């Protein structure tokens, strides 16, 4: 929402069992809500001590390996599970299917505040890396890079540049540093205009049909595949209200009795895995929160993408 004064780069973090189930309709890379909740956890744990405000994540995903397996004779896939403990009686517990995946992402945390001036850049970069080393990103532990070739350090890029050329130089230097991955942005205006063209073709078509049409490899007869611009994916773009907002000590069995609970439901927007130098400014492509809590509509996106 606001512009970051600096752009921190947490380097390639190895996540071993992330959540492959991003949403009820999407499997694969975990939801960007996990990464925005991670940067809010980082702000809640060391952001208040350094007098900075870590907002926004650029999700890069150098490596992804889902713990899946294609069954024999089926085109679809199934998830490799774990073995839960037995019950108190000795029988096998009722299995619940949780998708696990191995990640390697690097995060662009947009850091703005009055703590960039108090501390050096390398100190606050090192302290948020040490705080991220004892955390988890989507349910999966962050592997801490022991006894390898060399440890990947951080770089807090002060985005306030003296010139346009030095700014473009350090943006290119950072893009070369997070290069083999694929930045994730939220392209929802493309989904809405594809819904507009779909409704032009056939009326009363809703945007779930436009989302599914942007998802699949659909064929057209003269046979030619309808082309897709980029790697468009369905992503859960936040939540939506189902119940009115309850009081803190009102709902039963909540997490805490001091925070208002509201029953919610996902909102599957459209995302687009694009390469990091297709953006020409890394102060875009960061994932912020947008709540508007009177209406529901607790959503996350990349504002200022285009």
């Amino acid at each position: 929402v606001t512009d970051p004064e600096a752009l921190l780069l947490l380097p390639r973090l190895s996540i071993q069992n992330a959540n492959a189930i991003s949403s009820p309709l999407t499997w694969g890379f975990p939801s960007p809500g996990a990464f925005t909740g991670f940067v809010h956890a980082l702000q809640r744990r060391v952001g208040i001590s350094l007098d900075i405000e870590l907002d926004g994540v650029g999700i890069v995903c150098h490596r992804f390996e889902a713990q899946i397996s294609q069954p024999a004779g089926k085109r679809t896939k199934v998830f490799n599970l774990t073995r839960n403990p037995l019950n108190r009686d000795g029988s096998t517990a009722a299995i619940v299917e949780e998708g696990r995946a191995h990640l390697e992402v690097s995060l662009l945390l947009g850091v703005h505040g009055d703590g960039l001036d108090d501390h050096p850049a390398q100190e606050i970069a090192r302290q948020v890396q040490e705080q991220a080393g004892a955390m988890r990103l989507a349910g999966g532990s962050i592997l801490p890079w022991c006894n390898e070739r060399f440890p990947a350090p951080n770089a807090e890029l002060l985005m306030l540049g003296g010139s346009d050329e030095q700014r473009r130089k350090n943006q290119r230097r950072l893009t070369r540093r997070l290069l083999p991955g694929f930045a994730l942005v939220s392209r929802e205006a493309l989904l809405q205009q594809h819904l507009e063209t779909l409704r032009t073709t056939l009326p009363e078509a809703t945007t779930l049909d436009a989302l599914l049409d942007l998802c699949r490899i659909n064929f057209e007869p003269p046979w030619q595949v309808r082309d897709k611009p980029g790697w468009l994916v369905p992503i859960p773009a936040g939540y939506n209200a189902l119940s009115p907002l309850y009081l803190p000590g009102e709902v039963r069995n909540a997490r805490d009795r001091e925070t208002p609970l509201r029953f919610v439901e996902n909102l599957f927007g459209l995302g687009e895995w694009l390469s990091p130098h297709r953006v020409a400014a890394l102060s875009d492509l960061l994932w912020y929160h947008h709540a508007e809590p009177d209406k529901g509509l607790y959503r996350w996106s990349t504002p200022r993408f285009v």
Partner: protein, 108 residues
């Protein structure tokens, strides 16, 4: 743009993941490329090839890469004798321009 960007990512993961560009010597290894061996010829040879890559700044790989995209197009003279070849050449020139300036600053 997607082809040029996948070429940039292939060069990135090949230059970063494998030390195999400086694994063995031979007679033919296409040594005019000098882009998929960035840390291979500088982090070991300090003044031998690093002084031949920073002053020379090898960015002539894009001219050889343009031959791939001329192989991607056919010999259709309905565009070669029309203004579609001009639009094709202008988009290829601006895209190899951005590929050149991305390839120019491998030294920083």
């Amino acid at each position: 743009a997607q082809i040029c960007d996948e070429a940039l990512q292939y060069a990135a993961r090949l230059r970063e993941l494998e030390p195999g560009w400086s694994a063995t010597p031979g007679c033919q290894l296409h040594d005019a490329e000098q882009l998929w061996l960035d840390p291979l010829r500088a982090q070991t040879d300090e003044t031998f090839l690093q002084r031949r890559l920073r002053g020379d700044w090898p960015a002539e790989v894009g001219n050889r890469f343009a031959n791939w995209l001329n192989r991607a197009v056919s010999s259709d003279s309905q565009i070669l004798g029309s203004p579609e070849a001009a639009q094709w050449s202008q988009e290829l020139s601006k895209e190899l321009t951005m590929f050149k300036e991305i390839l120019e600053d491998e030294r920083d």
